Curated annotation (Swiss-Prot), chains A, B:
Cofactor: record remark: Binds 1 zinc ion per subunit.
Activity regulation (record text): Inhibited by melatonin, resveratrol and 5-hydroxytryptamine.
Protein name (record): Ribosyldihydronicotinamide dehydrogenase [quinone]
One biological process term in Gene Ontology: quinone catabolic process
Length: 230, 230
């Protein structure tokens, strides 16, 4: 029945390590016969700000602007900006969404934060029933593929940065799990810049390798225990 | 001495609950005789995207664009875009920085994430070495004044969202502490959209009342234990 993959990609430089990782995911998932689409946010000059431009025609309450309410009603009334709905159509059709980004301040770059803020609107991604286990994107897989400046040692529990999993919580749980995604284990490529050449080649190779059996994987249990506990 | 306060404010609607919490801070700090400046991000149409437009000089490596490297050298050389250096002057002069924002996906709205990505560059906010307790903003205070959709109850260890302190980690530790700020306890105003008129007025006056004695507070111990316990 085939599978559709969306890669949401947030790097300014096509020759970057992130670009290589995105390119390998494209090469390998396309080799398997999957339908692959990439949202190259910087190349699209993707709008990160949540503003009233995100609603076309006339606001639900033009006196006091409430982004959440107005985007909810806009979704229901098919009245959202086309950049947003173009993205929601790719997500709707995806079986798997991979986010490929460098870690910026223990989180996603603002351009990709703006994608999550604007694309994952109430009525599309969640509503009152239909959050966490029940969220509107249930059935879909999501996966963070993150590159870091810090070596793997810095990201241990008693290290300076604390555990990798500590920063994962707002993205995996607060965002992806909230919307119904099952979350595969994050791919974390530690510290590509302090190399080496061969060691960079090796991390790109390992991601490609993992993508081979991505469809065999089980989701993580997306829990406070998984992130912080023992 | 007296003191300088910068409020970095991220809400689209001046009549909003965020609007009121920013306005009471300006009013109370101004009443005390403090110097007060507000960076009203949406009104400034503040650029959230980290791009090569943020550097105007000869790039250190114009064949492969690396945002961290290029902004660090642009800072030393003074070729950063001026919107960034305008913010930096505000932070440099400040004794206290307050971030006033609605929680968006367990984090800051993208427009304010872009402020942290672009303004807190290497050379200015931190160096290597020169971070966490050696951060370049040592001696300044910071405070997150966050509003939520979820109730206090929802943000407890056994509630749907887990403890409120879990989502504070990337912002308090990975960003502010990393830059050397001493972090004051977060002001979290839970679920104003749900709350009654009296409860909302109550939340605004509790912030006003807290600001009366802010200069007397000790910072939090910004550690994994404060954040996750326990
Ligand atoms: C605003 C900001 C905030 C940040 N916050 C954090 C943080 O909170 N925590 C943290 O750890 N880090 C942080 N960083 C560091 C950041 O996460 C790293 O800079 C980034 O992940 C490096 O990945 P890259 O793709 O840009 O590396 P690149 O510099 O693009 O790649 C490294 C090398 O790989 C080469 N390359 C590309 N493809 C290949 C290939 N196939 N094989 C071999 N070599 C290849 C490149 O040419 C380059 O020499 C931050 C950086 C910035 C700018
Ligand atoms: C993209 C997105 C992501 C989100 N992610 C999360 C999340 O991860 N977790 C979560 O909990 N929530 C989330 N939310 C919900 C969001 O945090 C809240 O909607 C926001 O915190 C509420 O603050 P506000 O200023 O917008 O409230 P408002 O809607 O502006 O205020 C509520 C009421 O208070 C009134 N008010 C204004 N001033 C005063 C005053 N002086 N005295 C008394 N009343 C006053 C207003 O008139 C209004 O009637 C998200 C929302 C969006 C849009
Ligand atoms: C803002 O840039 C940041 C922020 C960080 O932590 C918050 C970082 N932590 C690390 O362990 C290693 C690096 C390199 C790093 C970094 O820049 C390269
Ligand atoms: C995407 O918007 C979000 C995301 C959330 O958690 C991620 C939320 N959690 C809550 O507890 C309560 C609310 C209102 C909420 C919210 O607004 C609808
Ligand atoms: Zn979860
Ligand atoms: Zn800390």
């Amino acid at each position: 029945a085939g599978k559709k993959v969306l890669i949401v990609y947030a790097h300014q430089e096509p020759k970057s390590f992130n670009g290589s990782l995105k390119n390998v995911a494209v090469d390998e998932l396309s080799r398997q016969g999957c339908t692959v689409t990439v949202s190259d946010l910087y190349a699209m000059n993707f709008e990160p700000r949540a503003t009233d431009k995100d609603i076309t025609g006339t606001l639900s309450n033009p006196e006091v602007f409430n982004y959440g309410v107005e985007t909810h009603e806009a979704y229901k009334q098919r009245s959202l900006a086309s950049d947003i709905t173009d993205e929601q159509k790719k997500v709707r059709e995806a079986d798997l969404v991979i986010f490929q980004f460098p870690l910026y301040w223990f989180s996603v770059p603002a351009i990709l934060k703006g994608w999550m803020d604007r694309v994952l609107c109430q009525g599309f991604a969640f509503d009152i029933p239909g959050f966490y286990d029940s969220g509107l994107l249930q059935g879909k897989l999501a996966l963070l593929s993150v590159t870091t400046g810090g070596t793997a040692e810095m990201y241990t529990k008693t290290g300076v940065n604390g555990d990798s999993r500590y920063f994962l919580w707002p993205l995996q749980h607060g965002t992806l799990h909230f919307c119904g995604f099952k979350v595969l284990a994050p791919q974390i490529s530690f510290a590509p810049e302090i190399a080496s050449e061969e060691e960079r080649k090796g991390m790109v190779a390992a991601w490609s390798q993992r993508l081979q059996t991505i469809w065999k994987e089980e989701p993580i249990p997306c829990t406070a225990h998984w992130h912080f506990g023992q």
